[PDB]
Design a protein around this ligand. Structure first.
Ligand code: GNP
Ligand code: CL
Ligand code: MG
Ligand code: NH4
Length: 403
């Protein structure tokens, strides 16, 4: 059908260590919110972890986007994988969030991807975090619960989140989800577990602010994914960063290719509902005429033509992680070629250290230049993560664009 705007729109999502309950919580949110609002369509566990490879491996691999709303706001929710091998997908998901829900298992406490997701969330600009302490149905001991909360708050403090202030909601994603399956009409106040999900919804409503967005600046949408719709054509998905897009607009596909390509937008949808106009903050699919899925990819940006010049060379201020933060034990030299993550973009780059700086060590704050092997939409003040060999090794911010 058609998308009707009645409420402010905010993008949230789920992050946290593997198996702590992100997807189960995402499902419970749709069911719980749907009882109050009939515009919410429910999403089961298997509707979210739907890919054959997810069924095969028993984990989330792809980000999934689901929709729900409260009385206050409309939400698009990006559910990210927790497995260490799918961090790149999680980063692309977090790059779309105005706030993240950090899921931590009460039975396990914070674990290495609890830390890594918090760190990475910051580096793609997630401005606020709410915590859901999950699986409390498995933990009798009140003292362990208090310890887990304390550990999570302190961990958040380590990455410059206000850990002492974030809401920490204690519940069971699974028992809420079970109650909603048995009674899909279960309303607030009727059930203990469902009410914890309402506590989460209230915290999301009130603690994660609606961002200040600019719809007057040139259209810019980082591409998070691309697929072929049988019948329609190639669709590029993403959160619109600024400006607006309408069907009929010419856009440029910028980055990751030798040259920029122009095409015409032939459709705009949010959660499979047609948008008259996509605006900053919307989580959309943009149908692109005359390009295949081999001609658009994650990490490119769609932009008002001529508004963005992609770049390959920049100076950066970089913090290199210590080993206890999951970084490398050893340093690196000029010529080090790790991966750089900017918003939804993942690209290999060459580190070139100043003359006289021959080695950078874990724990170092340092400045150097990077040469990307492919051009990428970049700008001064843009935060990024550095990863190599399947581990996060650094966090940086672009200081100067050289080329
Ligand atoms: N006891 C209990 N088990 C739960 C709860 N929530 C989830 N689980 C169980 O925990 C396991 C993982 O749940 P899942 O939602 O897939 O976690 P995830 O964080 O999405 N995993 P991934 O990191 O791969 O995406 C499942 O076996 C699920 O049934 C809960 O509140 N209580
Ligand atoms: Cl579309
Ligand atoms: Mg999952
Ligand atoms: N998924």
């Amino acid at each position: 059908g058609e998308f009707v705007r009645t409420k402010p729109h905010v993008n949230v999502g789920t992050i946290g260590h593997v198996d702590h309950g992100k997807t189960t919580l995402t499902a419970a949110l749709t069911y719980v919110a749907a009882a109050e609002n009939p515009n919410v369509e429910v999403k089961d566990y298997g509707d979210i972890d739907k890919a054959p490879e997810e069924r095969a491996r028993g984990i989330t691999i792809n980000t999934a986007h689901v929709e729900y709303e409260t009385a206050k706001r409309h939400y698009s929710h990006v559910d990210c994988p927790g497995h260490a091998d799918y961090i790149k997908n999680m980063i692309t998901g977090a790059a779309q969030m105005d706030g993240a829900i950090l899921v931590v298992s009460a039975a396990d406490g914070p674990m290495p991807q609890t830390r890594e997701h918090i760190l990475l969330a910051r580096q793609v600009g997630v401005p606020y975090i709410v915590v859901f302490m999950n699986k409390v149905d498995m933990v009798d001991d009140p003292e362990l619960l208090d310890l887990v909360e304390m550990e999570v708050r302190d961990l958040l403090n380590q990455y410059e989140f206000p850990g002492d202030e974030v809401p920490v909601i204690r519940g069971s994603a699974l028992l809420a989800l079970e109650q909603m399956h048995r009674n899909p009409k279960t309303r607030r106040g009727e059930n203990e577990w469902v009410d914890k999900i309402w506590e989460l919804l209230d915290a999301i409503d009130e603690y994660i602010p609606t961002p200040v967005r600019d719809v007057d600046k040139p259209f810019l949408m980082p591409v998070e994914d691309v697929f072929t719709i049988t019948g329609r054509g190639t669709v590029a998905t993403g959160r619109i960063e600024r400006g607006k897009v309408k069907v009929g607009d010419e856009v440029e596909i910028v980055g990751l290719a030798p040259e920029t390509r122009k095409t015409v937008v032939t459709g705009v949808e949010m959660h499979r509902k047609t948008l008259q106009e996509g605006i900053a903050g919307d989580n959309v699919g943009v149908l692109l005429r005359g390009v295949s899925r081999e001609e658009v990819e994650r990490g490119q940006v769609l932009a008002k033509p001529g508004s963005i010049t992609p770049h390959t060379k920049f100076e950066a201020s970089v913090y290199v992680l210590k080993k206890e933060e999951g970084g490398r034990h050893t340093g690196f030299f000029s010529g080090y070629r790790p991966q750089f993550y900017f918003r939804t973009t993942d690209v290999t780059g060459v580190v070139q250290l100043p003359p006289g700086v021959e080695m950078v060590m874990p724990g170092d704050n340092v400045t150097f230049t990077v040469e990307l092997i492919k051009p990428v939409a970049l700008e001064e003040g843009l935060r990024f993560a550095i990863r190599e060999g399947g581990r996060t090794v650094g966090a940086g911010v672009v200081t100067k664009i050289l080329e």
